[PDB]
Amino acid sequence: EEKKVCQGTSNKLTQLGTFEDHFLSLQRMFNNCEVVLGNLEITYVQRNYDLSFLKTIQEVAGYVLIALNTVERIPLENLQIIRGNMYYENSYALAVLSNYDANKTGLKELPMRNLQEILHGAVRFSNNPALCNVESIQWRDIVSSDFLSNMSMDFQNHLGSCQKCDPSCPNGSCWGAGEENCQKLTKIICAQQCSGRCRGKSPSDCCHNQCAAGCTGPRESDCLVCRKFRDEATCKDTCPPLMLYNPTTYQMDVNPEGKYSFGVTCVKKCPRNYVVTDHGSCVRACGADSYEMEEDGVRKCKKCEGPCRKVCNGIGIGEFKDSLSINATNIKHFKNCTSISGDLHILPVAFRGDSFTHTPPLDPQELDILKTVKEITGFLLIQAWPENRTDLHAFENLEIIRGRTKQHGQFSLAVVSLNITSLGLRSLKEISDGDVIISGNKNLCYANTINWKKLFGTSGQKTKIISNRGENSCKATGQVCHALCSPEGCWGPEPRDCVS
Amino acid sequence: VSITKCSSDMNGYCLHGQCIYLVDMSQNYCRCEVGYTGVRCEHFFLTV
Ligand SMILES: *[C@@H]1O[C@H](CO)[C@@H](O[C@@H]2O[C@H](CO)[C@@H](O[C@@H]3O[C@H](CO)[C@@H](O)[C@H](O[C@H]4O[C@H](CO)[C@@H](O)[C@H](O)[C@@H]4O)[C@@H]3O)[C@H](O)[C@H]2NC(C)=O)[C@H](O)[C@H]1NC(C)=O
Ligand SMILES: *[C@@H]1O[C@H](CO)[C@@H](O)[C@H](O)[C@H]1NC(C)=O
């Protein structure tokens, strides 16, 4: 079982074709998902459409958006925490907006009974003409005190169709109507002796500081949700240090419980992809004066002596955080980069230009600059390429795709909807992590000849090559690997492209 | 009506779709062509 995870969606309030196609995509993304790393968006959903899969969702790290729904009930019954790592509209971790219909009734049921803490952000309710009993829910326990002012919740439902809360219910604050759908106070009912949350009002019934929403006892394992970091069933403020402080130590206090830091959890060993620092953490890139070396085949931060190579950030991160694709404005910063500390996107908008971003068109010849790069720490996405060129000339010297960051959290290499006849990625020797997708390239041929398994390093990697030019069509056009290389395939028609 | 036709100034905003106006939010968003994801439908949703 472990924890089932979904990447989430960041499409804001954008429709995905028809309503049914949108609902389909939603159910693919959030089927069986116990923990959402990203943003949970429930938008453009229609009445009498099954939404029961949402019962499985326990956590949402980003924000929860619920909008443009004609549905009667959305069943986030087991959702218990909203970490608030990402805000919607820069100040709302939970947003329920404009849930109306041609008929007066819109959204009426939101039974988030287990919801107890929103670590960061505020809540906004607007244009909801059918919501029931969410008005009674008091948000002092749920929302952080610092973000309370930013809350802008206003309910507009005079239907009176909603029922009343149960007598066993604290201050009449209920989520829906049953006794199970009521406020659970773990913050306000606490004594002055508790720090943070509490299981009961008595001093003996307090929660540990790292217990997040609630606890069943004053123990780290009894924490229902982890606040900061997680070790086994325990929740901790920090991953246990490999070396800890001691009052008097003949040698460094090596901790038998010391574990490496990876994301929200603490693992025993960092993956081969990430930089294992001496402090004990899985890091994506070395900082200042530190560059990447392999001591025993694992990456580490060695201090540069004086001058040090430039850390060329990828598109979508750093200075180019909101940049959709490489374009004329940002292509100059990649002049002499031998490595891409990030992920590289290429989209058709770059060649046409975008007035909304005030972006000029991109020159095809300028792309040749990318020939200097040999290692991409993140992922490569190619949705556009110059029409005159028949191969990915710029990435001919690319060697290793580390795949530390992947598109949609899955694909490290993507080449879709290109007219190129051959890939031409001759120098590519290792795809350390992430899947590969080659689809919709009408004139591309030499893809299935290559054995992508030898390129794959991490176990479980898969390849998906479809909708390219057919093998029969390419064979009839003489577009098959050169005779000088019988096995292992090739990257193009000429002998230079043969694999070894 | 929830959806309104965007003004012609929002012409190329939707890379793979058509601009739509949400009157309650008073904002411009996209109707994506099938298979495309993102606010501006910028990235192709990669099938498994
Ligand atoms: C071509 O490449 C260039 C260079 O990388 C790239 O330019 C970038 O465009 C984005 C979008 O216009 C810029 O990001 C903006 O920065 C301003 C700075 O004040 C912000 O105010 C903007 O805020 C918006 O987004 C916020 C959320 O992030 C919202 O909360 C807010 O309400 C606004 O909607 C926005 O962040 C970025 O600064 C430039 N960078 C440079 C160096 O010019 C361009 O986008 C690329 N073109 C394409 C088509 O990819
Ligand atoms: C969701 O996951 C369950 C569990 O494997 C599966 O039985 C079901 O078919 C899935 N639903 C869809 C729509 O794929």
A112 within 8 A of A77, measured Cβ to Cβ: yes
Q: CA A87: distance to chain centroid? A: 14
A376 within 8 A of A350, measured Cβ to Cβ: no
A301 within 8 A of A292, measured Cβ to Cβ: yes
Which experimental approach was used here? Answer: X-ray
- Of residues A10, A107, A16, the one with CA closest to residue A64: A10
Q: Touching check for B19 and chain A: CB below 8 Å?
A: no
- Of residues A439, A11, A321, the one with CA closest to residue B42: A11
A460 burial level (CB within 10 Å; 0-12, 13-18, 19+):
exposed
Q: CA A141: distance to chain centroid? A: 28
Q: Which positions ≥6 away from A296 have C-beta within 8 Å?
A: none
Q: What is the DSSP letter of A463?
A: E
Q: What is the DSSP letter of A42?
A: E
Number of CB atoms found within 10 A of residue A455's CB: 20
- SS3 for A141? coil
A114 within 8 A of A92, measured Cβ to Cβ: no
How many A from CA of A410 to the centre of ligand 2? 19
Q: Which of A11, A410, A417 sits opposite B39 (nearest CB)?
A: A11
Q: How far is Cα A258 from Cα A244, in angstroms, rounded to an integer?
A: 9
A236 within 8 A of A248, measured Cβ to Cβ: no
Q: Which domain range does residue A56 map to?
A: 5-172
Ligand 2 cavity residues, CB under 6 Å: A 27, 31-32
Q: How far is Cα A138 from Cα A185, in angstroms, rounded to an integer?
A: 10
- A92: CATH: 3.80.20.20
- Of residues A205, A424, A315, the one with CA closest to residue B43: A315
- Strand blocks (E) in A396-494: 400-401, 411-416, 430-431, 435-439, 463-466
A179 within 8 A of A169, measured Cβ to Cβ: yes
Number of CB atoms found within 10 A of residue A393's CB: 16
What percent of chain B is helix, strand and coil (3-state, nearest 5)? 0, 40, 60
- B39–A12 C-beta distance less than 8 A: yes
- Order of strands across the sheet that contains A411-416: A344-346, A380-382, A411-416, A435-439, A463-466
Q: Which positions ≥6 away from A461 have C-beta within 8 Å?
A: A431, A433, A434, A435, A436
Domains in chain B: boundaries: 1-48
Q: Touching check for B43 and chain A: CB below 8 Å?
A: yes
Q: CA A221: distance to chain centroid? A: 27
- The residue whose two tokens read 């794959």 is A456
Backbone angles phi, psi at A438, to 5 degrees: -130, 105
Task: From chain B, pick out residues whose CB is under 8 angstroms from the CB of A38.
Answer: none
Q: What is the DSSP letter of A496?
A: G
Alpha carbon of A372 to those of A101, A191, A338, A429: distances in Å?
55, 63, 5, 16
Alpha carbon of A93 to those of A38, A56, A137: distances in Å?
12, 20, 17
- Spell out where chain B is interrupted, by the residue before each break (C to N > 2.5 A): none
| Closest C-alpha residue for ligand 2 atom 4 | A32
